[PDB]
Write a protein that binds this ligand. Structure first.
Ligand SMILES: Nc1nc2c(ncn2[C@@H]2O[C@H](COP(=O)(O)OP(=O)(O)OP(=O)(O)O)[C@@H](O)[C@H]2O)c(=O)[nH]1
Ligand SMILES: Nc1nc2c(ncn2[C@@H]2O[C@H](COP(=O)(O)OP(=O)(O)OP(=O)(O)O)[C@@H](O)[C@H]2O)c(=O)[nH]1
Ligand SMILES: [Mg+2]
Length: 175
């Protein structure tokens, strides 16, 4: 649970290719928006942050959306403590891919109450095909938070990662 007395949280960002998981992560870690698309195999970042007064060590795993790197899933799902399940609000297919990740996480962790947050990214764009209410209704049925983000403008970026931390904390305080 702790590293040098700081509370450790192992966050994993998952979702289809091109949804913005790297841009989100890099916005949180480095406070800059990546405009280019450099597909990820698997990257990781640590960040010391205060969340609700608690000094946390975040270990954020930035995973592959491209199917060619699927063999790496089982390993990150075993070690991850909470999952940001990311789709893009202009990509219907990405929204339809959410439960591919969710069900795989549940299967690997053999658990129905794994901490997760649904993230609808690219909320800056005009061309929305996935509505707020539609994604909200899904997250409600899952019993998880839903947050709209823009890696470009920073809207909701902290909220997405910090909500996940709060959910893990609540899951842990239960036990
Ligand atoms: N307008 C806008 N573009 C975004 C946003 N987030 C990401 N992008 C762009 O979308 C493209 C892909 O973003 P990435 O973060 O590389 O995507 P990814 O989900 O990490 O992709 P994989 O690593 O292949 O799974 C890039 O060109 C980003 O600049 C956002 O919030 N708004
Ligand atoms: N966790 C998980 N994700 C999966 C699985 N199969 C596919 N995916 C994800 O979903 C994507 C493919 O789903 P779609 O967006 O419908 O794509 P598609 O039509 O099958 O193929 P393309 O459009 O060519 O990418 C992959 O790139 C992965 O990100 C699976 O078994 N488990
Ligand atoms: Mg990436």
């Amino acid at each position: 649970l702790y590293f040098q007395g700081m509370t450790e949280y192992k966050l994993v960002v998952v979702g289809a290719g091109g949804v913005g998981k790297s841009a989100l992560t890099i916005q949180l870690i480095q406070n800059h928006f990546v405009d280019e698309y450099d597909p990820t195999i698997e990257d990781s970042y640590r960040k010391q942050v205060v969340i609700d007064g608690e000094t946390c060590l975040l270990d954020i795993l930035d995973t592959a959306g491209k199917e060619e790197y699927s063999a790496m899933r089982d390993q990150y799902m075993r070690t991850g403590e909470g999952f940001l399940c990311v789709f893009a609000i202009n990509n219907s297919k990405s929204f339809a891919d959410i439960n591919l990740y969710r069900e795989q996480i549940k299967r690997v962790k053999d658990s129905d109450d794994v901490p997760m947050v649904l993230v609808g990214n690219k909320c800056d764009l005009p061309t929305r095909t996935v509505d707020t209410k539609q994604a909200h209704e899904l997250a409600k049925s899952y019993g998880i938070p839903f947050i709209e983000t823009s890696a470009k403008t920073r809207q909701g970026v902290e909220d997405a990662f910090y909500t996940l931390v709060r959910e893990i904390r609540q899951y842990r305080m239960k036990k």
